[PDB]
Design a protein around this ligand. Sequence first.
Ligand SMILES: OC[C@H]1O[C@@H](O)[C@H](O)[C@@H](O)[C@H]1O
Ligand SMILES: OC[C@H]1O[C@@H](O)[C@H](O)[C@@H](O)[C@H]1O
Lengths: 589, 594
Amino acid sequence: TRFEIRDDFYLDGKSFKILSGAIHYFRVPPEDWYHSLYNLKALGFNTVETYVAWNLHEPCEGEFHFEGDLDLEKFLQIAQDLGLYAIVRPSPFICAEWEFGGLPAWLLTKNMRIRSSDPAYIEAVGRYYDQLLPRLVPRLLDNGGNILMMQVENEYGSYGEDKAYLRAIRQLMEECGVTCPLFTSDGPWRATLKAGTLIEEDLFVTGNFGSKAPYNFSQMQEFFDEHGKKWPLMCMEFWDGWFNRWKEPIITRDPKELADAVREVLEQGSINLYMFHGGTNFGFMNGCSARGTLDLPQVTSYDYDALLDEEGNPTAKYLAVKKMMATHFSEYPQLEPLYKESMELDAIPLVEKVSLFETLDSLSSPVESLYPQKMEELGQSYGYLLYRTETNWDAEEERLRIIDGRDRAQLYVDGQWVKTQYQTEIGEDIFYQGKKKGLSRLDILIENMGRVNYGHKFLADTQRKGIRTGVCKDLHFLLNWKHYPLPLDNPEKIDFSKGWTQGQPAFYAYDFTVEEPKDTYLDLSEFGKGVAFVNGQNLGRFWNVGPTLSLYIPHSYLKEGANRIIIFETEGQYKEEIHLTRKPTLKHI
Amino acid sequence: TRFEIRDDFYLDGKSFKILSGAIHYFRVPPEDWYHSLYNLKALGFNTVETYVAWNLHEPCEGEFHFEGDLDLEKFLQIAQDLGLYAIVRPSPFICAEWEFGGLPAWLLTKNMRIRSSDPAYIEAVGRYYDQLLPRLVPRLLDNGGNILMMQVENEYGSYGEDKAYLRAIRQLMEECGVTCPLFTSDGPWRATLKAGTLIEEDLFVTGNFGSKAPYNFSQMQEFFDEHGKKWPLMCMEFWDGWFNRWKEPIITRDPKELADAVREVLEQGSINLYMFHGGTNFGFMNGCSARGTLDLPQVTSYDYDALLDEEGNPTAKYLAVKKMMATHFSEYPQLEPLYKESMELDAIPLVEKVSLFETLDSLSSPVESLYPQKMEELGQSYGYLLYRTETNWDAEEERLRIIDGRDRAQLYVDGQWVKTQYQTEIGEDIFYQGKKKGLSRLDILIENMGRVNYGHKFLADTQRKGIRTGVCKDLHFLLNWKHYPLPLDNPEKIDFSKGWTQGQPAFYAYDFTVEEPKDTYLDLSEFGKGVAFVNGQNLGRFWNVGPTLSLYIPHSYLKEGANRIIIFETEGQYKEEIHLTRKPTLKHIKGENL
Ligand SMILES: OC[C@H]1O[C@@H](O)[C@H](O)[C@@H](O)[C@H]1O
Ligand SMILES: OC[C@H]1O[C@@H](O)[C@H](O)[C@@H](O)[C@H]1O
């Protein structure tokens, strides 16, 4: 065996220190995989680590995708070609500040206990592995690839103590032909280590933490000694920055201090920098944090204050680590990192616009039923959902209430905006004075702002989006609903020839020519809320609450010559022109 | 046909004004049905009205009960023998300040949309109707009984607009032989009347309100006119008082004002006083109000400030209405009302006591599973549910959290109380310094304090009681649970020979002898919280927050000779003896009115 875990890591009979950086293939465009992997190599590090996102690879049950932006095999091959080893964490649940922690949303339509030894759930994970694992097994080092070892579950000690669950996953991997060493990662204290591991069954244990390697490793060492294990020390996630959430201030970490904290790990064991290069949560795939009953959604940018910025350029922190390495670990060869240049344009004018209500039928085909349905039971995972019904008014003024809706609701009557309610505001009284004669159109646009990816709210009832109970008018729930799923995966269907109306959700088109594609940032600091596309590719979410006020556009999303940017904006605040900038626009908080 | 709804109510061809009073057979001991019905007749009224509680008659799916306390047929026979007509409202949902609006809790384990045209739900209502309605059909006036008409659903306009649902309920009733007139009742304004009725299919419409009969009846009249109906006006629930909730002050209504308000109703049409006699929510059958996301549980006493008090004696309000009737409707013959006498017994000493933990095994056979289960999925509808696990402490102090538990939780570690959390407190961090070595016993006692009986929270996730997600220790959910369902319908299984410990839920027994059984009130003002039994009969809940601090004990619950009260108290607060009083003990809360 080329890679062994004993009293130490051994690669080809020789003692080996793992120097790893996290780069999620699904967060960096494929055209920059080489760039980012090169820059990890140039740091003097020897290994790349990545999660695998189940929700991306099986977006609908039984429908699998492993090409293009999802070509994990190619990501791994470029790594090997650059002479990098790999650690893969293929857990059904990856946390990762990622939608539903990586779990497919269609699971919410299933009768199963997600993330447990429930066989209904295990079976699903099995079918997923039946597709994923055969692609990774040939890429094990022993088999001629570069994969050193793989993770079982992910910080399971911060969720449960179901050992049968951990054993089931390990078993599934083994019988699919995974013969490399397997391991768990957890918080480095007793409670999480006990609950999250199979140490008594010889399953390798790693710790996750972002400082104080000496103390944390000692807790790990004490745990190993307790079980008679003579094992190397590895930090499977050394949090070197952090993620950002809407409305919350961007907080960076001192490059030098991070540099020193990393040194402390390397002196005692191995490391995987989380993140090395963080990249972006394109489209609707951002995750969400929880505090008690409250959800706190995470931003589109996964810059993370990582070594490489969102775009993939080295930072003070990268340079500070390069120097810490050249000073304290000079035996590890270094190189010069690659840089990309960003481009800059001013005032690309508005060509065309259209209200959602006007282009609604080319975008979406409605589902009708007596009672309102939830997003996932309609077959939708991500995006927006429009509930439509008709009702006449039975009094000069009437009260409307959305009962058990999530995450954000905008209510219109005959096209006129009445109210917007976010999270815990949903359910509050809405008062309306409607036409005395005839049916009036009640439209409620719902947005899924990202399913919680961790902890006690992981399987809360609020994880199913849309209206779960109903909409009350006076004292009775309204019936006869038309549902328009709006995943907005079909931006080519937006009909800009139809009408536009102030104070409504709408699409705004901006055209421009590009001579040579270069990275750049869409300035959206004067738009309210929504998503943006470039040549039909969903860039992710914007929101003027900050801290981020821009969307990053990779050079590879642009095309020589004519380009089209499209902005879906829901608040009614837009601009007749857009700026593309060199540097992202930030809101001070 | 003897009874018809035309441009008026006609009985045997003659104009007829219905003078009805609500008495719920299930809220009054059967030995006192005659008493209550007689007093209704003595008022000069001609009709009694009652809901039927599905959750009482079908306590477990497929298991039906119509005897004893639930002998609705005997209640109707007593009314008839006393010369009273009857209105029955056999809606699957009755609201009624009653647990889960009368719906069986086991419906929560089914894949169905409760209270809708969902055929799964309709099929359940039908199977229940298959047992209930054949019992009432022989009792329709046309068949020699006293039932004039029956209600379809209940204020459905305060819940939905599913016309297929209403039609389904109508169809089921007809299919079972119900040929008397049918009707709906709703709030008397446009939204509720449109949503709640089948007026366009000639289903009779009635209104519920507590005042301003002239104004409320004109709203009903406009609706009728709009649909070309010349119908009599009837108030199917004239709210004459109101219910109480724990921690909330008792507010009464002036006897004269209420008499006046009733006079206004009768001047234009027919009435059904809600309640004529309210009685008692025995055992765990109380309902629950909601405000936004918050639950507001209703109290054991359904006195309601009704015309007869809980005990069933005429009140100042009864006398006010009687004087009004004597003056303004003297053509209705009256009688002298009946009064029951109450008793008092001092300092009945505590004889025996046993902590719940010590008598667990005779009360309840454990259900063991890896993940924690909710109350209904274990097969339990009412009462308490103990969750038990074992765990070792991985730090000097660890955090515990109960995730998604309702309604009230008490947590013990190795028999020692750590914390009690009610409703929204559940889920707050609990910090504990655990044993130095080995497994500790983690006990969590959950109480179902009553499912919401109305409105937007009627089918909230919180309606399923117990722990719906789990119990977190540090950052992980705990596994390996033993569940002990504690419906407490088996007080004879309490083993007072076992041990007792301070600061724990426990049972306490007080013995006494009675020569002549009379009504009386158990003073529980110095007991924390729990339930009380007399001769094995669950009187209902007590809680020292008030406003009620007693439990009414009907004479029929007592025996000539030796009697035993058992008190289950959860807070650790009890006294070495109890007093029975002639009148209830109340707690003075700010805002109260008498
Ligand atoms: O960036 C925060 C990190 O937290 C870790 O505990 C988790 O395993 C990662 O997936 C990521 O969510
Ligand atoms: O006492 C309040 C009443 O409210 C009515 O609307 C309901 O129909 C009754 O069952 C009862 O709940």
